[PDB]
C-alpha cells in the first residue's frame, strides 16, 4: 500500500536529497549500510520514480501570478471568495 504514503515518500526523498547535499559522506555510509533494502524496494516499488532517480545518482511562483492579481484587484465579495476558495 505505497500509494497512500505518497506525501510521506516525497518528504522522505527530499530529506534524503538534503542529506546527500549537506553531508555526502555520512549519507553514503548510511546507504551502503542499508543498500539491499533500498534495492529490493526499488525493484518491487518501481513506481517510485524519485527512488530510481536516486539510484541513477548512486515554476511554482509563475503559476500563482493570475491568482495574486485577481486577489489584489478584486473588490466584490464574490471575487474574493472565488480566489480564496481556489
Amino acid at each position: 500500500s505505497s500509494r497512500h504514503l505518497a506525501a510521506f515518500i516525497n518528504k522522505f526523498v527530499q530529506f534524503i536529497h538534503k542529506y546527500i547535499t549537506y553531508n555526502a559522506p555520512a549519507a553514503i555510509s548510511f546507504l551502503q549500510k542499508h543498500a539491499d533494502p533500498l534495492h529490493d524496494l526499488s525493484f518491487d516499488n518501481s513506481d517510485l520514480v524519485m527512488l530510481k532517480s536516486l539510484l541513477a545518482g548512486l515554476l511554482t511562483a509563475a503559476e500563482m501570478a493570475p491568482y495574486m492579481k485577481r486577489l489584489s484587484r478584486g473588490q466584490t465579495v464574490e471575487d474574493l471568495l472565488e480566489v480564496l476558495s481556489d
Partner: protein, 74 residues
C-alpha cells in the same frame, strides 16, 4: 547519435538523464562502463580522460549525459 532524432523520447539534460538511466539494459551497460573506469582510474587516468574528451569533441550532443553522470560521481 542515431536515436537523437529517430525517437520521440529525445533542466533539459536532467530530464535526459532521467529518461536514459530509467531503462534497464542501457543502465546495466553504463554500470559496466563505470566499473571498467573505476578499475582504470587508478591505473591510467590521463589516457582515459584523453580518450573521453576526444570522443566528446567528435560526438558531443550524443553521450554527454553519461559524461555528466561520471562527473557527478567524480
Amino acid at each position: 547519435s542515431t536515436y537523437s532524432g529517430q525517437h520521440q523520447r529525445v533542466g533539459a539534460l536532467n530530464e535526459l538523464l532521467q529518461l536514459w538511466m530509467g531503462c534497464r539494459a542501457t543502465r546495466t551497460l553504463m554500470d559496466i562502463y563505470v566499473q571498467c573506469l573505476s578499475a582504470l582510474i587508478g591505473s591510467c587516468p590521463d589516457a582515459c580522460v584523453d580518450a573521453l574528451l576526444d570522443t566528446s569533441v567528435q560526438h558531443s550532443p550524443h553521450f554527454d549525459w553519461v559524461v555528466a553522470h561520471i562527473g557527478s560521481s567524480f
